[PDB]
Nucleic acid binder design. Structure first.
Lengths: 72, 72
DNA sequence: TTATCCTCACTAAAGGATAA
DNA sequence: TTATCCTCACTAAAGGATAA
């Protein structure tokens, strides 16, 4: 159930949920994509100033992609 | 036709296309959402270090939302 | 119309690491 | 395991603005 997302907080919460559902650690994702674990922690908790690059890398680590859609 | 997106560049290119297709100026979107036109120009051309907050605001201006999906 | 410029205050992310 | 800390180099984004 991938819902429409409207903010960095909503985005981070959804992505964290995917990580937890799959039983992945922050450290293991971070290693896979070559970024700091600390960076993933910052994304999950403090997403607003997170870069697009960090977001896409994490998305890849989670075996996810994204699409645009209508706001409704 | 909203396709899967895998990078900041792909994301920016898709969003610019929506703006152009609708005939919107950078200046008008920027006004609507209270950010600089320069910021929108930076997003479209240099998206990699753009913040999640900027991305979501622009998405709103474009009458768009986003969802997660499988990478495939 | 939009890429581009100046300045300033702030932050992300890298390097490194810790507690419990 | 993950939130959190230090440092440093870099940038985004705000304020302001321009050319043509």
């Amino acid at each position: 159930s991938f819902q429409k997302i409207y903010s960095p907080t909503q985005l981070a919460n959804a992505m964290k949920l995917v990580r937890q559902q799959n039983g992945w650690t922050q450290a293991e994702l971070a290693k896979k994509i070559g970024i700091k674990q600390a960076t993933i922690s910052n994304f999950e908790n403090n997403p607003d100033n997170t870069t697009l690059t960090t977001f896409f890398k994490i998305l890849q680590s989670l075996e996810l992609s994204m699409t645009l859609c209508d706001a409704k």
